[PDB]
């Protein structure tokens, strides 16, 4: 069904499709094989539908969490990179594309949460979560606030909760243990206790959400906020003298934000696997290809070191990379729908006061 002799790549509309087109033009100049770059609407649902029928693009770009389900459905072909190319990428990035003990896709870009602070209102951001109450009181003495972020999202509340050993699913030897869940362990209990203490001590509002936090930060009413690279354009438009650093530690342990890795998968029914692998290894995942794609649309942290130390000159990119390295890699199995539901319910119950921290975490675990 997929035509041989050419490469078809599907990418999301918010990524660097023009840069991908330029890389494909370089590939066709080098080898004589044309490359087609498209950004179909509703890609997340369109790709599995066409892949289940033996059709679709030769190469697919999406976050690694759905690639596990795609490989479970058999829609992704196994890649065979040599040790020379494997050493060019980070070990945790390689871990991001491992399912059933076999590599299924090529990491491209790494995204994770980071601490965003106002330089004018706070030249030195705190390195620990315990300093936040004192800093917030000091700023309230000047009629301001220190830090407020999205408390309605488990993705945002996880870094504080899972700082001291909390984890979603146990990961050992390239396999995730579903029956082993650390939602209600000592570290997560301590993190959620600290969060609810911050809420109760009027340091943060339990009803604060993404819109309120973003507006408060871009209006200069806050000193710190927690957000990903996607808001950097918004703060740049708001012209706030902002800085990005590592997330504060809890009890001496670094925060563990969820890590999302953009990766390059190969269709199982695609008959152009050899040329797709060659293109990915020698033309796309190179300094020139990454810089072209970043020039089109920024990617933040990248899997390649040859471009990662190049992008490290940006403090925001360096902070995002170190936060991703220190954080928890997002697994790729379907039961995190239930995981998100349970953690969200536990967080809402703990913040709203209907249930205690221990009861909420026990309910989330069960």
């Amino acid at each position: 069904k997929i035509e041989e002799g050419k490469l078809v790549i599907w990418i999301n509309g918010d990524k660097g499709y023009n840069g991908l087109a330029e890389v494909g033009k370089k590939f066709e100049k080098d080898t004589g094989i044309k490359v087609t770059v498209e950004h179909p609407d509703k890609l997340e649902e369109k790709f599995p539908q066409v892949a289940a029928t033996g059709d679709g693009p030769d190469i697919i770009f999406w976050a690694h969490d759905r690639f596990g389900g795609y490989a479970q459905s058999g829609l992704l072909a196994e890649i065979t990179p040599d040790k020379a190319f494997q050493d060019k990428l980070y070990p945790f990035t390689w871990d991001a594309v491992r399912y059933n003990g076999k590599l299924i896709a090529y990491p491209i870009a790494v995204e994770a949460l980071s601490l965003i602070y106002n330089k004018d209102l706070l030249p030195n951001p705190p390195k620990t979560w315990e300093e936040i109450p004192a800093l917030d009181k000091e700023l309230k003495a000047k009629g301001k606030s220190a830090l407020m972020f999205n408390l309605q999202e488990p993705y945002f509340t996880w870094p504080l909760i899972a700082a001291d050993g909390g984890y979603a699913f146990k990961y050992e030897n390239g396999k995730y243990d579903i029956k082993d869940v650390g939602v209600d362990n000592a570290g997560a209990k301590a993190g959620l206790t600290f969060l609810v203490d911050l809420i109760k001590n009027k340091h943060m509002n339990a009803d604060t959400d993404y819109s309120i936090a973003e507006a408060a930060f871009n209006k200069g009413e806050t000193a710190m906020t927690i957000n990903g690279p996607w808001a950097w354009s918004n703060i740049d438009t708001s012209k706030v003298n902002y800085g990005v650093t590592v997330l504060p530690t809890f009890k001496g342990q670094p925060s563990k934000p969820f890590v999302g890795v953009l990766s390059a998968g190969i269709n199982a029914a695609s008959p152009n696997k050899e040329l797709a692998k060659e293109f990915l290894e020698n033309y796309l995942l190179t300094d020139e290809g990454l810089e072209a794609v970043n020039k089109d649309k920024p990617l933040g942290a990248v899997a390649l070191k040859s471009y990662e130390e190049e992008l490290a000159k940006d403090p925001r990119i360096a902070a995002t990379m170190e936060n991703a390295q220190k954080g928890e890699i997002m697994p790729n199995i379907p039961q995190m729908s239930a995981f998100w539901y349970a953690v969200r319910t536990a967080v809402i119950n703990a913040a709203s006061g209907r249930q205690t921290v221990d009861e909420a975490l026990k309910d989330a675990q069960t």
Epitope: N12, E153, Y155, D209, E214, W230, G260, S337, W340, R344
Partner: nanobody, 125 residues
Framework: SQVQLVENGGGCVKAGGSLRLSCVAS????????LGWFRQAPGKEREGVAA????????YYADSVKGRFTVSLDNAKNTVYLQMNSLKPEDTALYYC??????????????????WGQGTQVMVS
């Protein structure tokens, strides 16, 4: 695709009129926590018009439609509605229905949601 969204209720309405839209979600939709509505004029970027948080009932509205649109979800019918009151000619576009289990960005972004519907067309003269 176990989650499907179907839109209807779009009609030809004069300026200042009132219209209502419906979006029915079918399948395994127990894990969906965000319901959002998007409109896309022909040849224009898809813009967020409303968003709903199922867990707590929190609603989100854009600046251009704040105080004019009302979005609500019926749990007993698994259908989300949006009330289009005080219409203006600028409101004509192809209205889409979106749903997502979770997200890391603002709920008014098209990339926030994973499930998308076919869309309905509303014209205001």
């Amino acid at each position: 695709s176990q989650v499907q969204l179907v839109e209807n209720g779009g009609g030809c309405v004069k300026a200042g009129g009132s219209l209502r839209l419906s979006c029915v979600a079918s399948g395994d939709i127990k894990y969906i926590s965000y319901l959002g509505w998007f409109r896309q004029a022909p040849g224009k970027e898809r813009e967020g018009v409303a968003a709903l948080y199922t867990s707590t009932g929190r609603t989100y509205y854009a600046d251009s439609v704040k105080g004019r649109f009302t979005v609500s979800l019926d749990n007993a019918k698994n259908t989300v509605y949006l009330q289009m009151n005080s219409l203006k000619p600028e409101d004509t576009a192809l209205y889409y229905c979106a749903a997502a289990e979770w997200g890391s960005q603002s709920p008014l972004t098209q990339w926030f949601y994973r499930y998308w519907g076919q869309g309905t067309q509303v014209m205001v003269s």
